[PDB]
């Protein structure tokens with residue numbers, strides 16, 4: 001689809017079998033999802049944002065369906081204001097910026 | 100143009116008479132520019148994201164050219180690690196997400 005930006009580009013995703021709302025974020029290198037239980041082993045990691053650094057749980061090779069498009073990659077779980085789909089998964093679904 | 104997301108979508112912008120590199124960020128409501136001695140009246144503001152909040156100076160009706168496309172609006176100036184072009188200006192240049 002083509003999504004304009006008058007509002008936050010929020011879309012529904014399925015991860016770990018559960019539905020969640022997430023923001024398509026071209027300003028994010030990584031995908032960061034609010035605290036939740038995800039299958040598999042995770043590794044402690046730290047990532048930075050506009051306000052500083054946070055500790056996250058790094059899960060690798062996680063399937064995430066974004067607005068009907070499939071991606072399988074790294075998902076960081078931790079204290080984020082809103083769920084963020086970053087470039088690692090946006091590239092997988094063939095998302096581009098256009099103007 | 101079309102910008103892929105394999106790498107950070109950095110483009111050249113012109114603001115306050117200076118050329119800078121900035122990130123086209125669909126996950127940002129506002130535009131935040133690295134500390135620069137911009138003239139004009141401003142209002143105090145706090146913006147948040149991953150890691151927490153930072154204090155910025157809010158300037159209104161500031162002309163900002165983005166890869167040749169003219170825009171004008173609110174620009175927040177503060178200790179951001181990267182210049183960020185947010186939705187307030189992305190809509191002005193007709194930018195969309197597509198997949």
Ligand SMILES: CC(C)[C@@H]1NC(=O)CCCCOc2ccc(cc2)C[C@@H](C(=O)O)NC1=O
Nearest residue numbers: 027028029030048049050126127149180181
């Ligand atoms: C969501 C983070 C994993 C991402 N943070 C990253 O992509 C890692 C680099 C963080 C420091 O540099 C920044 C780069 C970009 C931004 C802020 C800071 C914009 C901001 C956003 O989503 O709007 N991006 C981030 O906070």
Ligand SMILES: CC(C)[C@@H]1NC(=O)CCCCOc2ccc(cc2)C[C@@H](C(=O)O)NC1=O
Nearest residue numbers: 050081082126127128129146147148149183
């Ligand atoms: C790049 C920042 C301005 C930030 N945008 C970001 O930090 C990128 C997304 C981080 C997680 O999602 C958000 C977190 C916080 C917000 C919006 C989104 C609130 C909103 C604000 O304070 O006005 N912050 C942003 O849009």
